[PDB]
């Protein structure tokens, strides 16, 4: 198989006698295929930055092992060269400490796997607008990726209602550095949707939210280039192309 860096793929496996799916010593969780009782699914994601050239997964069964090889593709992302090199910034301590603390909190959430579906059918887009900055736009130094856009930006004047892309449980609902006023929703199976730069947050941590329910108003909080909605998806432990993920997910789970 082949997979572009920064995208997710739904792996299909036989359910009968399946025991576990491993990359190296890391276990990959599985869930039911909604349409074929004899199959299960797993989400495999490649990181955008510094992905391996090739991946070998192993599905262990009661009396056989199945090897799955995935070649990494560079894709056709937009990219521009940086001419500074030292993307090493020097924030003051108070900002450094806040960034570190919010990173620890987020990583605990994104690795807290919910082994059931909290979603309800297909994902919807969180507002009926258009993309102004696509996922995966990169800045490179000597053909090494220094940074990239980890979600997709929708056009939105300040105060535009933002709706949950699918049902789930709110895990983050506060102002964070970089992300500004942020909402993050657990949809189950390690799938998280992200809504950044809001001007108003209308949900609370722990709230059960339904697909299409208001979660806040768009804004420009934490955003340099003016008002917009930044929409992200994390799945298989990595940020992935959100519109690509939604298309692949909906092809399987569509109502
Ligand atoms: Zn963005």
Author numbering: 20 to 274
What do the study's own words say?
We have described herein the reactions and the structure of Pgp3, a Csd protein of C. jejuni. This enzyme turns over the cell-wall peptidoglycan by both the d,d-endopeptidase and d,d-carboxypeptidase activities, as documented by mass spectrometric characterization of the requisite reactions with synthetic cell-wall fragments. The Pgp3 monomer is structurally divided into four regions: the N-terminal domain (NTD, residues 21–95), a flexible linker (residues 96–147), the LytM domain (residues 148–259), and the C-terminal helix (residues 260–273). The Pgp3 LytM domain contains a highly conserved tetrahedral Zn2+-ion-binding motif (H168xxxD172 and HxH249).
We decided to mutate His216 and His247 individually to alanine in order to abrogate the binding of tartrate or citrate at the active site and impair catalysis too. Indeed, when we solved the crystal structure of the H247A variant, it showed the absence of citrate or tartrate electron densities within the active site and the protein only assumed the open conformation, which was fortuitous for efforts toward solving the structure of the enzyme complexes with substrate analogs. In the uncomplexed H247A variant, two water molecules (Wat-1 and Wat-2) occupy the active site. Because Wat-1 and Wat-2 were essentially equidistant from Zn2+ (2.9 Å and 2.7 Å, respectively), we could not establish which should be the hydrolytic-water molecule. However, the crystal structure of the H247A variant in complex with the substrate clearly showed that Wat-2 was replaced by the incoming substrates, concluding that Wat-1 is the hydrolytic water that attacks the scissile carbonyl group of substrates. The distance between Wat-1 and Zn2+ decreases from 2.7 Å in the uncomplexed H247A variant to 2.6 Å in the complexed one.
